[PDB]
């Protein structure tokens, strides 16, 4: 149903997400403290406001799409008292599980409904409205939120209680990072063995080793012409963002006392690579295994 | 139609040879274990006291043996007994270096030779669904194809000699890494209060998906048939995975390659095989706190 939505954070993800909500007939009230972000969002039909409290004042739903837990926490502290009681808050930022539960609790103590709904699919998913939302919180609250999320989404998955969205995401992305390094390692070893890249591709993809890091993101040019390796390692999914998600994985590991040997090794590998190659697709880590 | 000498009639070699008999081949056999040889003779293999005798009348000689050293020693023991242009197929899993050496040895005797290691285990072997990954010439593979077919679900030409070994060892190194990574994720999810079923639904629907989770799920429930629901009965044993990883490490050393994650997995599984060699390799989920 047609709803008034405050959208806080109108950057690379926020702006195309808000555009799709405008497209779907929603009244969208935006705030972003970077005026260039606000401007682009305004051009696609977002009513932009001077302050986050103002955007929130007349909203049935408040979406945050923000860079860090700290920024989300700060935003919530600024805006929750300005919101009408029992407003629905959706945080679609990617933040630590700890941060997520903290801000969830904060929202509920102000009388607001709240979900964590971080997304995968990147800017291209965002623009095409094919993002996967991975949701933590009450089933009934998600029920309410569904018609707001659908115009932005390819998939909506209920993961469990508050924080389970962030948890599911960060677990997947840790696995992914490990797979991307492992695939790169196999391709270089193959090369040193005289096994052709095409041959190795055909085998792994036909065998138990198959995974998106090879079938879609193949780190050598040729076998999958759409993969970033064929395009100077243009993201795609940048090393900067993978390194962020791995930091959040390591936060979760630290918070739980879990043991994740390879997840953590992959974290240290991507952190070193991020220093000088933050801008390249995460499949570019193959470069560290050659010469 | 064809006479085949089958050298190595063990857990894999016995059922593979039974399938060859089943497809109308004359199978001649050798194994140093009487129990293996006897079982094989029970399903139609003519068992001989030595490998050179088994080889004498054969058009094709298949090896299924435990190490490159044994394969090399077999070749040097039988090559003079073979007729010229006999087709040698090594379906042992040995190092790429060993494969190429024995390939060159065989061809120097005017024989034709392939490396064709297999995936699928005893189960696959008995069911005739093994995946053969082949190195050697395409024309030689073509000539071999009617022998491989009755043992095989899948036959892939990987490249020149050694490429079959190479492809297998590279896939299994990745598999080992995946199996550990998936296990990490399940125990992480559990400590975060994320249910095993929710994690499973997400990963299988997302970029992290792989066989290690969709078929070998290391926690019981999401995949009722996975070894986790059956006391981690193999499946694919830790002993065997540890074997393949040893071979990956030889290949890494031999080439001077950088394989930090593959190597780390190799370390983990080598440790784990000291205590739980007989369990499915997905059981590694319960050795993360070591
Ligand atoms: N490929 C991707 O871009 C991708 C994919 C999935 C998830 N994510 C995650 O999405 C989140 C944001 O993505 P993005 O690309 O839009 O980030 P971005 O950094 O491009 O934009 C963040 C925006 O938030 C604004 N902001 C900061 N403080 C604010 C406040 N108090 N109120 C309102 N706005 C504020 C900033 O000015 C900026 O425009 C991150 O948590 C990121 O890790 C990104
Ligand atoms: C993703 C959502 C439908 C919305 C859409 O396709 O934009 C659903 O299937 O739950
Ligand atoms: C030719 C066939 C193998 C025959 C078999 O199924 O046993 C295949 O390549 O799949």
């Amino acid at each position: 149903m047609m709803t008034t939505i405050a959208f806080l954070g109108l950057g690379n993800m926020g702006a195309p997400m808000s555009a799709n909500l405008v497209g779907a007939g929603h009244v969208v009230r935006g705030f972003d403290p970077a005026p260039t972000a606000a401007s682009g969002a305004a051009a696609h039909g977002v009513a932009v406001f001077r302050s986050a409290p103002e955007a929130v004042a007349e909203a049935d739903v408040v979406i945050t799409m923000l860079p860090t837990g700290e920024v989300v926490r700060r935003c919530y502290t600024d805006v929750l008292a300005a919101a009408r009681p029992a407003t629905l808050f959706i945080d679609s930022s990617t933040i630590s599980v700890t941060d997520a539960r903290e801000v969830h609790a904060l929202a509920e103590s102000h009388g607001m409904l709240q979900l964590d709904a971080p997304v995968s699919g990147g800017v291209k998913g965002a623009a095409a409205a094919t993002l996967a939302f991975m949701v933590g919180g009450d089933e009934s609250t998600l029920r309410r939120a569904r018609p707001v999320l659908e115009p932005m989404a390819g998939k909506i998955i209920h993961c469990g209680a508050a924080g389970a969205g962030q948890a599911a995401k960060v677990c997947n992305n840790m696995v992914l990072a490990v797979q991307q390094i492992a695939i790169a390692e196999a391709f270089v070893l193959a090369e040193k063995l005289g096994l052709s890249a095409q041959s190795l591709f055909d085998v792994i993809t036909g065998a138990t080793g198959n995974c998106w890091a090879v079938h879609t993101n193949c780190p050598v040019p040729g076998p999958v012409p759409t993969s970033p390796a064929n395009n100077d390692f243009k993201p795609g999914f940048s090393t900067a963002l993978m390194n962020k998600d791995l930091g959040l994985a390591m936060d979760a590991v630290a918070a739980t006392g879990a043991t994740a040997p390879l997840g953590s090794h992959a974290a240290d590998i991507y952190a070193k690579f991020a220093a000088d190659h933050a801008d390249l697709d995460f499949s570019a880590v193959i470069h560290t295994l050659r010469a």
Side-chain angles (χ1 to χ4, degrees), chain A:
Chain A
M1 236 141 261
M2 175 188 210
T3 310
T4 302
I5 313 164
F7 209 118
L8 315 179
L10 300 162
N12 295 335
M13 294 294 283
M17 292 162 82
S18 61
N20 292 325
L21 294 173
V22 171
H26 301 285
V27 177
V28 185
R29 300 166 60 89
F31 180 73
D32 190 299
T36 46
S39 190
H44 296 87
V46 173
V48 160
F49 290 82
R50 216 166 298 270
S51 70
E54 287 179 63
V56 146
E58 311 294 2
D60 308 307
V61 180
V62 180
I63 307 169
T64 47
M65 190 56 156
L66 298 166
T68 67
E70 179 53 31
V71 181
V72 173
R73 182 163 39 242
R74 173 39 160 69
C75 178
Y76 275 26
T77 298
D78 278 17
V79 306
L80 282 167
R84 303 183 317 213
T87 302
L88 171 50
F89 280 69
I90 305 178
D91 185 41
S92 282
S93 318
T94 295
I95 69 178
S96 73
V97 176
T98 297
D99 288 357
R101 289 171 178 158
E102 189 191 348
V103 298
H104 174 75
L106 179 64
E108 285 204 329
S109 72
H110 279 82
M112 310 302 156
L113 286 178
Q114 200 270 4
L115 301 170
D116 49 301
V119 300
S120 75
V123 293
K124 288 158 191 202
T130 62
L131 300 167
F133 286 81
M134 291 157 278
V135 177
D138 313 299
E139 256 148 303
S140 59
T141 305
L142 174 56
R143 161 172 339 105
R144 175 174 165 181
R146 225 145 200 141
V148 170
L149 303 181
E150 281 163 7
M152 293 180 292
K155 197 208 297 314
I156 295 169
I157 323 142
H158 193 222
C159 296
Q166 300 292 353
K169 186 175 174 175
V170 75
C171 287
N172 183 87
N173 281 17
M174 185 173 68
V175 177
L176 178 57
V178 173
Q179 282 157 345
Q180 195 64 69
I181 293 160
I183 287 293
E185 290 175 9
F187 274 102
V188 186
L189 177 57
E191 164 176 18
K192 303 216 215 296
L193 285 175
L195 174 62
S196 81
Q198 189 62 57
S199 293
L200 184 73
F201 182 88
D202 290 342
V203 169
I204 289 190
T205 55
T208 48
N210 190 30
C211 61
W212 184 100
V214 58
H215 63 66
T216 301
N217 219 38
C218 183
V220 304
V224 189
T226 45
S227 75
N230 303 275
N231 217 76
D232 316 302
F233 293 98
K234 256 86 180 175
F237 188 167
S238 74
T239 295
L241 288 171
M242 182 50 88
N243 179 56
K244 175 184 187 219
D245 285 347
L246 284 164
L248 296 172
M250 296 299 97
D251 301 325
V253 165
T256 56
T259 54
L262 304 189
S264 306
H265 197 156
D268 179 57
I269 281 164
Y270 270 111
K272 283 165 181 141
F273 197 58
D276 294 303
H277 308 93
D279 300 316
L280 303 182
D281 185 86
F282 82 119
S283 62
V285 70
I286 194 160
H287 294 149
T288 68
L289 315 179
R290 292 213 185 79

